[PDB]
């Protein structure tokens with residue numbers, strides 16, 4: 190059984206739109222999305238389809254770029270730090286579940302290298 194995906198909508202949660210959050214959607218997310226190694230991270234891990242019954246038993250805070258993209262588009266975040274935390278969770282999740290050799294890990298590392306260089310250039314709040 191797959192769990193419910195992370196929430197991308199919640200009217201109770203305080204929301205903001207900031208140039209940093211705009212940057213995260215416009216630059217950071219768009220670069221990673223169009224990348225060739227993006228496809229495994231573009232949606233939640235369907236552990237049923239992939240026959241990974243253990244995945245959600247070990248991964249307790251799942252996160253993927255589809256969810257992140259929805260959150261950015263639906264103005265879900267208060268600050269850039271929340272979004273950055275989601276991207277990092279996604280990478281860490283992948284390193285925890287998989288062995289260091291695996292293709293998925295090489296794909297995550299290439300994406301992360303890209304993520305970390307774009308985050309270096311996260312603008313000061315305006």
Ligand SMILES: CCc1c(C(=O)Nc2cc(S(=O)(=O)NC)ccc2C)[nH]c(C)c1C(C)=O
Pocket residue numbers: 228229230234235238239241244282283286287293
């Ligand atoms: C290796 C499984 C995995 C994916 C992934 O999605 N792989 C995948 C998905 C489909 S698919 O049929 O579901 N179509 C999209 C088909 C084939 C593959 C290899 N993503 C992450 C983060 C992981 C893990 C466990 O870290």
